[PDB]
């Protein structure tokens, strides 16, 4: 049915759903109704309240076939679903991105895009994939972990697990997994989904006293200037950019600035991008605001620290700083002035940005307005610097600038992460005292068992080729050992596998929605459930916690990850009880959980309460005031964390902006400046740059979500992006005799991978941009092993050569190579 | 008393011609919530004037008579400031004593405008009372209708403004004139300042010279000015 849609009946069930994907956390409604009912076209005869008796005007709805589906429940009954944006949600005001817009299509149905969802335990029984029971899966998995604990201790048990929010994260799930890994198993051999150790993206800003989500989305409406540093927000944080940033650039929020601040000038809002690449976000900002209100600081790759040290030096020398703020609320300023000193000429030589542009950015951002107040300058950053040239140092440099200019704690300011996933962290403390580079450990032959949980590092590790090589080989040893068994009990098989891991083998488990490329190495795969198949809580980039309501059943025996963790814990407890080991059994207590809500009560709602163990929670110690029922009453607007108060008549009252009284998260309540040395690129990256021609920039496409775990099954997505693409300069293209839809090898000392050629006029000569994380042509093969002091990778820092494989005529027939930069 | 609330930098600013005399001096009306105020620094108030120190002569025209607090239909209170426009060609920032009082003569419940008519008033034989607009129209239209039906238009009399400014102007003279002349069609109409429907300027118009035939700039270019039957410093 291409040319019509079944309307939701007026009385259709409606539940709340936060978007599964990106940080912004847009609010949606899920309409659910029996397959053989429909709404009428009259606005009072359908659930949308829209008049389908005549054409709707623009902006009246977001509604396509991709936003509809028919689900088949565990009882065999069929129900229409419609997943559409909430017009009254403050986050998105009825906007839907292309990614969230596909939620309905990516819900589980037996015939649709979710048809290959994991529905039962899968086992690679030496030489073939077969189903197995949950009890056999637990006996084998628990069995191995138990054997490893008994013989090697926790250091033999490895995880890479999500720490994020939204789908495949959230407060229930991070608690469940963390409780299992850290309180029960007590393994330190744990990495995170996007980085190869147990660390933070935001060590420097946190240690300086500024948590990275310190403002409201409303702040982007109130700003004079917005910086977007290492950040492509139209593509990566769409509806924050569309619903909040653009209205400011258009002048729609001016009256609200003036109402808040009667005696302050508000010029036209301007936007500054720090990005080596001219992105869609740069183009669209120019289209909306005019070229005169956009500054693209097209820095040389890796030179962000030089940029910020030059701007900091200049604003200090001009006196464009808040000296009363510095004096009352900060420590270390005078030291930072000395350590970070860099002239605009030196800054220009390093960055490649002309001195006029450096001065202009400072004049827009820091020079007092005519009324006497500093500009309200919101500094927004993401992975261009988080995966940049020395994560810790860039944040040090940037924060120094922000603190000196009092661009934290004022409305219309903030130095924030734009975010990736939603947030939803509640976990015990990490049980080690050392940073551990998990990938390197695995590649060196450590560990008996490795579990990928809600992540796929074959596609997303730095130095991903070294990783896959090692894991495939180690998996093979286990497969070969399993093959000699005939008629073995589970316990005998556990011994067979364990022995294989003493000869270089590794048992691999994946806990997932889908097989993924991890199926090339995995011995065991367990089915998980996503939001709508379960209740799930999470918060967005302004700390707004929402409940995503269950409205349908998972596929087969798929389970919420927190309940998978409880399953594992209880299997281990039972084995220890059976083995007469009361002390070891006791470590696996506390997982008597029947629904996801129990994990919410056990984690988020216990943080900082009397008799609670140490819990690190984004909800803080007032987490207990949030209940599922209270979130339901709040709607898609939720509450900004931390919660300050609750009663029946008021609801949840929370916190708009952090640090508005100048009390920071440090020992003394002051924000702390840090030294930020410029040391160039890391030697390992510089070596690549010296040997090879092209900078291999990498990151997001608007349409593609992450490792394309859903998108790989979507015929539209596959027709548009059948292969990972690499944006190349047209002149570079002519020199390599390539054009749109040719395939190239991209390669260096670290790896070899493949991409389709995407000529892009806005790409600079000797620079490229490749889609990351993809199912066909994995970008990460060419990223280096280099990390900063806290084991944060410089994913955006690598160089390689490009060789033509040949012309893919089919790509040329079916794929658009036209410009993605709107003008 | 002895102080003034300054308009905030971002205060609302509208244009207002003086209510009163022919000169039509230009003013600005600053409007802002009662609980906000401007700062003394010139860039922190709407006037752009430096109230951190004494102002020189000619820098401003500003007294308490040029300020008020109005109460709107929503019950919310707003400071107003009614002051001459410096860049208006007519007056170049001058305010007469009459126009200078405009803020004071805006309607407020407790001020000089306190006895403004706020509803229809009816003298019901032996006492003043309020009445509704519908009752007022039923009585007034009713009478006019009865008079038209029995006496024709010649039973219905008016004396009405024909002038501009407050209590006149193009919208108002059209409205009244269309009513009196096109609809009711009564000739029994006089003007505010004279007891027939006539002109002050019959002779000069019939001689071919309408009476407002120059610019104020012409008073700047003249060798000689005659002021005939005219007290122009006062009028």
């Amino acid at each position: 049915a291409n040319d019509r849609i079944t309307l939701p009946p007026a009385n259709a069930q409606r539940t709340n759903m936060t978007c599964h994907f990106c940080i912004v956390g847009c609010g949606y409604h899920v309409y659910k109704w029996p397959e053989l009912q429909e709404g009428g076209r009259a606005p009072e005869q359908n659930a949308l309240g829209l008049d389908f008796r005549k054409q709707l005007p623009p902006l009246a709805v977001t509604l396509t076939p991709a936003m509809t589906n028919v689900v088949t429940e565990h009882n065999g009954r069929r129900y229409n679903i419609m997943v559409v944006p909430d017009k009254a949600c403050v986050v998105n005001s009825g906007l839907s991105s292309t990614r969230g817009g596909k939620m309905a299509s990516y819900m589980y149905t037996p015939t649709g895009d979710g048809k290959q969802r994991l529905k039962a335990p899968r086992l690679y029984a030496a030489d073939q994939w077969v189903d197995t029971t949950w009890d056999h899966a637990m006996a084998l998995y628990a069995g191995l972990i138990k054997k490893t604990l008994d013989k090697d201790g926790p250091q033999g048990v490895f995880f890479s697990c999500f720490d994020h929010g939204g789908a495949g994260g959230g407060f229930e799930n991070t608690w469940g997994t963390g409780k299992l890994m850290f309180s029960a198993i007590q393994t330190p051999m744990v990495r995170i989904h996007n980085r190869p150790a147990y660390n933070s993206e935001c060590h420097a800003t946190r240690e300086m006293g500024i948590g990275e989500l310190n403002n409201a989305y409303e702040d982007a409406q109130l700003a004079d200037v917005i910086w977007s540093i290492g950040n492509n927000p139209y593509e990566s944080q769409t509806n924050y950019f569309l619903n909040h940033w653009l209205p400011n650039l258009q002048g729609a929020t001016t009256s609200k600035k003036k109402e808040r601040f009667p005696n302050e000038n508000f010029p036209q809002a301007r936007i500054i991008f720090v990005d080596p690449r001219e992105t869609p976000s740069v183009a669209i900002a120019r289209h909306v605001a005019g070229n005169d209100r956009v500054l693209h600081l097209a820095i040389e790759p890796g030179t962000d620290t030089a940029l910020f040290n030059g701007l900091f030096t200049y604003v200090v020398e001009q006196g464009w700083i808040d000296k009363p703020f510095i004096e009352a609320h900060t420590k270390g300023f005078d030291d930072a002035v000395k350590t970070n000193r860099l002239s605009l000429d030196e800054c220009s030589n390093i960055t490649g940005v002309p001195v006029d542009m450096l001065k202009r950015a400072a004049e827009w951002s820091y020079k007092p307005k005519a009324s006497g107040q500093a500009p309200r300058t919101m500094h927004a950053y993401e992975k261009g610097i988080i995966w940049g040239n020395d994560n810790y140092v860039i944040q040090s440099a940037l924060l120094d600038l922000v603190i000196a200019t009092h661009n934290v704690g004022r409305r219309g300011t903030g130095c924030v992460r734009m975010g990736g996933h939603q947030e939803g962290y509640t976990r015990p403390p990490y049980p080690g005292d050392k940073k551990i580079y998990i990938d390197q450990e695995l590649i060196k032959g450590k560990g008996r068992i490795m579990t990928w949980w809600g992540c796929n590092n074959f596609q997303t590790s730095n130095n991903a080729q070294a990783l896959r090589e090692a894991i495939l080989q180690r998996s093979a040893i286990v497969k070969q050992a399993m093959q000699k068994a005939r008629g073995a009990t589970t316990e005998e098989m556990v011994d067979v596998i364990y022995e294989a891991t003493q000869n270089g083998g590794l048992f691999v488990t994946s806990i997932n929605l889908y097989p993924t490329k991890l199926a090339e190495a995995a011995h065991l795969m367990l089915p998980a459930a996503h939001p709508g198949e379960m209740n799930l809580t999470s918060m967005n980039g302004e700390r707004r916690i929402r409940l995503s309501e269950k409205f349908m059943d998972p596929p087969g025996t798929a389970m919420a990850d927190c309940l998978i963790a409880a399953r594992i814990a209880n299997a281990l407890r039972d084995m220890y009880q059976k083995d007469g080991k009361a002390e070891m059994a006791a470590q696996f207590e506390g997982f008597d959980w029947k629904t996801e809500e129990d994990a919410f009560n056990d984690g988020f709602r216990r943080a900082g309460q009397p008799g609670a163990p140490a819990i690190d929670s984004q909800g803080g110690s007032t987490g207990h005031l949030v209940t599922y029922d209270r979130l339901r009453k709040s709607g898609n607007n939720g509450v900004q964390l931390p919660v300050v108060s609750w009663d029946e008549s008021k609801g949840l009252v929370g916190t708009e902006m952090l640090y508005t009284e100048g009390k920071f998260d440090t020992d003394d309540g002051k924000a702390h400046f840090k030294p930020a040395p410029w040391n160039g690129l890391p030697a390992t990256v510089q070596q690549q740059k010296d040997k090879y021609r092209f900078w291999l920039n990498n990151g997001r496409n608007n349409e593609v979500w992450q490792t394309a775990y859903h998108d790989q099954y979507n015929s539209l997505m596959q027709e548009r992006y059948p292969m990972a693409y690499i944006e190349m300069n047209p002149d570079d293209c002519k020199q390599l005799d390539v054009t749109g839809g040719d395939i190239v090898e991209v390669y260096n000392d670290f790896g070899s991978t493949f991409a389709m050629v995407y000529p892009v006029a806005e790409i600079k000569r000797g620079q490229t941009f490749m889609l990351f994380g993809y199912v066909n042509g994995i970008q990460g093969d060419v990223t280096t092993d280099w990390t900063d002091r806290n084991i944060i990778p410089y994913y955006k820092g690598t160089w390689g050569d490009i060789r033509k494989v040949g012309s893919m005529e089919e790509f040329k027939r079916t794929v658009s190579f036209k410009s993605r930069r709107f003008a | 008393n002895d102080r003034i609330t300054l308009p905030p930098a971002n205060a609302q600013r509208t244009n207002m011609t003086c209510h009163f005399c022919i000169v039509g001096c230009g003013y600005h009306v600053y409007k802002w919530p009662e609980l906000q105020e401007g700062g003394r620094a010139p860039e922190q108030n709407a006037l752009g004037l430096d109230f951190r120190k004494q102002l020189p002569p000619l820098a401003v025209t500003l007294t308490p008579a040029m300020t008020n607090v109005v109460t709107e239909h929503n019950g919310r209170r707003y400071n107003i400031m009614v002051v001459p426009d410096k860049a208006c060609v007519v007056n170049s920032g001058l305010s007469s004593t009459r126009g200078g009082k405009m803020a004071s003569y805006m309607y407020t419940p407790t001020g000089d405008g306190k006895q403004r008519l706020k509803a229809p008033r009816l003298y019901a034989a032996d006492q003043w009372v309020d009445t509704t607009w519908d009752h007022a129209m039923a009585l007034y239209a009713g009478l006019i209708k009865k008079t038209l039906d029995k006496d024709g238009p010649q039973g219905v009399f008016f004396s009405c403004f024909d002038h501009g400014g407050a209590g006149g102007g193009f919208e108002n003279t059209w409205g009244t004139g269309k009513l009196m002349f096109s609809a009711i069609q009564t000739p029994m109409v006089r003007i505010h300042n004279r007891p027939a429907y006539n002109s002050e300027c019959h002779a000069t118009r019939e001689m071919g010279i309408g009476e407002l035939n120059n610019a104020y700039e012409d008073a700047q270019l003249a060798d000689v000015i005659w002021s005939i039957g005219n007290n122009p410093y006062e009028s």
């Binding site: 607007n637 008021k650 | 009662e34 919310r76």
Partner: protein, 135 residues
């Protein structure tokens, strides 16, 4: 000084959509000794805020001799147990009957559509037992 205005704090009350029709919310403004109520009336009134222009807020101290008044949900009034003054919540604190010489003071709320927030930003009228609203 210069200043002719009191320095009122900006105090978050709640988001508008949390308020139920005719279910008063308690808060303090402009300090913890000044008890106030905000109520969604359920029907627009002059100067009401929020999506349905119907949220109003008051000081609950009787402007006669200062007893905390109580919101009656059935009449939408504030009643004083001292000398039986009653104020209309739907007429900006107009005194229905009583011994006061001043309407119940209104707490001025900003309503922000973007956040759904209600912030107390001022007081219209003088709170009982105070030389100025801000001490």
């Amino acid at each position: 000084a210069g200043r002719t205005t009191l320095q009122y704090p900006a105090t978050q009350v709640s988001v508008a959509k949390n308020l139920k029709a005719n279910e008063p919310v308690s808060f303090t403004y402009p300090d913890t000794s000044s008890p106030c109520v905000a109520v969604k009336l359920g029907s627009p009134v002059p100067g009401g805020v929020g999506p349905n222009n119907d949220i109003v807020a008051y000081s609950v101290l009787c402007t006669h001799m200062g007893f905390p008044t109580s919101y009656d949900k059935s009449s939408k009034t504030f009643k004083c147990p001292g000398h039986f003054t009653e104020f209309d919540a739907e007429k900006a604190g107009q005194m229905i009957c009583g011994q006061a010489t001043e309407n119940l003071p209104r707490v001025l709320l900003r309503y922000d559509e973007a956040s759904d927030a209600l912030t107390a930003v001022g007081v219209d009228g003088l709170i009982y037992g105070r030389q100025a609203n801000v001490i």
